[PDB]
């Protein structure tokens, strides 16, 4: 109940789950979703299917505040990074843009050993 028409959708990709925040054009959340929210327990969530309904859920929830179109920001390299984007296109929302924006350090903190590989 706000009538924002336009806003932003942040897709957050990850190997373990995919989550999607929808947001007014200043970055304040309107609604969100993820694979858990959709229904999935541990481990499916990361699946591309999860991300499909995750994104669709979020958009359906945002059509309620009468959104017509959004900008897409995607961060993460997970599975179903794209399926979240496809789903927002076929969502009926108008995707005005897509922008990768996964954060990376200019060599900052020591990774956890699972992300260290070698030298």
């Amino acid at each position: 109940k706000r009538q924002v028409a336009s806003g932003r959708a942040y897709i957050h990709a990850s190997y373990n789950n995919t989550i999607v925040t929808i947001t007014d054009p200043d970055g304040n959340p309107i609604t969100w979703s993820s694979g858990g929210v959709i229904g999935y327990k541990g481990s499916r969530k990361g699946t591309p299917y999860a991300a499909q309904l995750a994104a669709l859920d979020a958009a359906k929830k945002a059509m309620a505040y009468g959104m017509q179109s959004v900008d897409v920001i995607v961060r993460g390299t997970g599975a179903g990074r794209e399926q979240a984007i496809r789903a927002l296109q076929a969502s009926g929302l108008q995707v005005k843009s897509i922008v990768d924006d996964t954060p990376v350090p200019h060599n900052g903190c020591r990774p956890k050993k699972k992300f260290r590989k070698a030298s």
Partner: protein, 155 residues
């Protein structure tokens, strides 16, 4: 089928309807290589189709067959973990055979004292979308896809 691809055998067409989708059904009704039994069952079943409905049996037959073949099924697969039921398409030649088979099996589940009657009533009920056989079709398709989550193995 490591080597070549294997062609579908082209079965000699019918003697009464001239259709190959029938001798197909007639072979599946057959057991222990008694083909005369099978024909006598099926053509009889056609005569009972004609009684309990004015419709030509051949359009009744084909109707139920189309009504039975699945658009999706599952096929177990693994990389690790456990056998993941993977949803996937049902390539036309298989829809053909899965339908014919289920039809006959379903037919022989029935309580009807003799065959033909069993076949007729199963051939009929399936045209009307009801009658177990369509159980398999639907409970296959429904059980497949319900694993959409694992459909990312298209092939």
């Amino acid at each position: 089928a490591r080597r070549r691809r294997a062609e579908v055998r082209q079965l000699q067409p019918d003697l009464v309807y001239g259709d190959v989708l029938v001798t197909a059904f007639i072979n599946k009704i057959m057991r222990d290589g008694k083909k005369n039994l099978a024909a006598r069952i099926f053509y009889d079943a056609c005569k009972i189709i004609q009684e309990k409905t004015g419709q030509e049996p051949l359009k009744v037959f084909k109707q139920a067959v189309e009504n039975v073949k699945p658009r999706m099924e599952v096929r177990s697969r693994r990389v690790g973990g456990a056998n993941y039921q993977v949803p996937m398409e049902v390539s036309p030649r298989r829809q053909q055979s899965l339908a014919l088979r289920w039809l006959v099996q379903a037919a022989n589940q029935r309580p009807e004292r003799r065959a033909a009657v069993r076949i007729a009533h199963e051939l009929m009920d399936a045209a009307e979308g009801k009658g177990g056989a369509v159980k398999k079709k639907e409970d296959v398709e429904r059980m497949a896809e319900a694993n959409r989550a694992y459909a990312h193995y298209r092939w």
